[PDB]
Amino acid sequence: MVATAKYGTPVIDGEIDEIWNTTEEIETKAVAMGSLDKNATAKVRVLWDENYLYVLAIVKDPVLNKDNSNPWEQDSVEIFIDENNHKTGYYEDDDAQFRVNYMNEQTFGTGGSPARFKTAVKLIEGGYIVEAAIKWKTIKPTPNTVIGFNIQVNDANEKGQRVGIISWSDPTNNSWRDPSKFGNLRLIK
């Protein structure tokens, strides 16, 4: 799976900057749990600059819940990055997993850090908008650079149970530990 992200610097606030319309929109259709017509999915736009990767995720989710103690079993979005795009079967120092729920509470998997994660969440009719900035850790990207990338949407019901797991490139729910499951994202001018 291959996608592209246009160069640009949006303001992290949950509002949709005009610039987001200049880059392609991808959809999370790789089902691991649940179904597209019944569970949380997202329309995603991606931008980038020399210092950060920017992600705009518009999530469709009629019931918001975060009662479960496990952050991944709360309504939330997970963003995966493989900076050198080695597509390894385990996480290298440059690989990372970031997570943020609908209440804008951040949590981190391997490689993730609050020092490199800025987020804003705005609720909307039928769901919520996540806008994030991920600071590069090992690279200073230039046009046509390609990284490993994926975005996952966790869907929890009113009972605090996760009923949906859907991402862009991974239908096996192994992104948290396997970079070879991410897709390819080309950073273009």
User: Where along the sequence are the contacts to Ca ion (CB under 5 A)?
Assistant: 10-11, 13, 15, 17, 61, 63, 75, 82, 84, 86, 92, 94-95, 155
Least separation, in Å, of the C-beta of 50 and Ca ion?
A: 19
Which residue's CB is nearer to Ca ion, number 26 or number 95?
A: 95
- State the nearest-atom distance from the C-beta of 41 to Ca ion, in Å: 11
3-state secondary structure labels for all residues of 18-71: HHHHHCCEEECCEEEECCCCCCCEEEEEEEECCCEEEEEEEEECCCCCCCCCCH
| Least Cβ distance, residue 188 to Ca ion (angstroms) | 20
Q: Please, which residue, 82 or 178, has the CB nearer to Ca ion? A: 82
> Least separation, in Å, of the C-beta of 20 and Ca ion?
8
Closest CB 189 distance from Ca ion, rounded Å: 21
* Separation of CA 83 from chain center: 14
| Rounded Cα gap, residues 72 and 2, in angstroms | 25
